[PDB]
């Protein structure tokens, strides 16, 4: 029993983190086989940052302008290229700790583990959701650029995020591992702002199922609702509209608890209209939307505690 924001074990990713320095700028890199992937911002100084012609800066660089440090060992860069907003630095040594891996791009509403890193040294791990506006509510300081986000399936690491920047609101933006940004953001220090965010409805429902699986039914009611009638309430409260696919994905949790999805939607409708009245759900006083249905199933018992 219990329900926690749980990250994946980070060791497979720890074995791949390196430090990349070009001039007086340093950040983190990801060393897989004989390639080190890192944000192209490593080739910029502070004055370059308003108007960087990343291209123009890269042609003026050689292989030996890139210092890659893996623990106590310097790796020799033998080739470099830019792919969108990341650099690929070919080194002369393949990483003996390279896990089975994939480069995956995730959807808003999905979750992943972040290994926060500084000077190529891992410092912390935490669980994140990709917000509908393509930002993440992370915890990152200067030097974190190049830390990665990931999921692990069996023993395959699916890398999905490389960290680049912090927006004025204090949320964070980055790219997939081919250097393509999530959302309408660019790697320069300019006035950028995220679009208006919404709450991930299917995730809130999944979390409500988690609460019932952990023996808690206080928010339940005897009412039901149509999909269209629920979505009319969701739009009023800045919740994402619910689809039949979301109802389908919630099926397994619905069968485990015996609560029809549209019945849980009615419970959520009541919670949105009435608040919580001083009560809590799984230790929170607001509706949590950073757990996916997969996250709930993975962590909760397969039996509901009736």
């Amino acid at each position: 029993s219990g329900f926690r924001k749980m990250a994946f074990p980070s060791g497979k990713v720890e074995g791949c983190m390196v430090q990349v320095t070009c001039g007086t700028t340093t950040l983190n890199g990801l060393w897989l086989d004989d390639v080190v992937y890192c944000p192209r911002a490593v080739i910029c100084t502070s004055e370059d940052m308003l108007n960087p012609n990343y291209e123009d800066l890269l042609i003026r660089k050689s292989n030996h302008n890139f210092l890659v440090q893996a623990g106590n060992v310097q790796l020799r860069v033998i080739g470099h290229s830019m792919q969108n907003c990341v650099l690929k630095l070919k080194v002369d040594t393949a990483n003996p700790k390279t896990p089975k891996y994939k480069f995956v791009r995730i959807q808003p509403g999905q979750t992943f583990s972040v290994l926060a890193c500084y000077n190529g040294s891992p410092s912390g791990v935490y669980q994140c959701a990709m917000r509908p506006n393509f930002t993440i509510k992370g915890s990152f300081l200067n030097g974190s650029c190049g830390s990665v986000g990931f999921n692990i399936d069996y023993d395959c690491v699916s890398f999905c995020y490389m960290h680049h920047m912090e927006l004025p609101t204090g949320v964070h933006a980055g790219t997939d591992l081919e250097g393509n940004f999530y959302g309408p953001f660019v790697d320069r220090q300019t006035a950028q702002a995220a679009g208006t965010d919404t709450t991930i409805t299917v995730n809130v429902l999944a979390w409500l199922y988690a609460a019932v699986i952990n023996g808690d039914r206080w928010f339940l009611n005897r009412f039901t609702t149509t999909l269209n009638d629920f979505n009319l309430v969701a739009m009023k409260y800045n919740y994402e509209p619910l689809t039949q696919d979301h109802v389908d994905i919630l099926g397994p949790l619905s069968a485990q608890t015996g609560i029809a999805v549209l019945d849980m939607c009615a419970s959520l409708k009541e919670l949105l209209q009435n608040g919580m009245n001083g009560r809590t759900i799984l230790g929170s006083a607001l509706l949590e939307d950073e757990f996916t249905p997969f996250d709930v199933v993975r962590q909760c018992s397969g039996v509901t505690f009736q």
């Binding site: 700028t25 911002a41 030097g143 912090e166 927006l167 004025p168 933006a173 006035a191 950028q192």
Partner: peptide, 10 residues
């Protein structure tokens, strides 16, 4: 206020 590229620049 302006976005920050969270490298460590000197």
């Amino acid at each position: 206020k302006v976005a920050t590229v969270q490298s460590k620049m000197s």
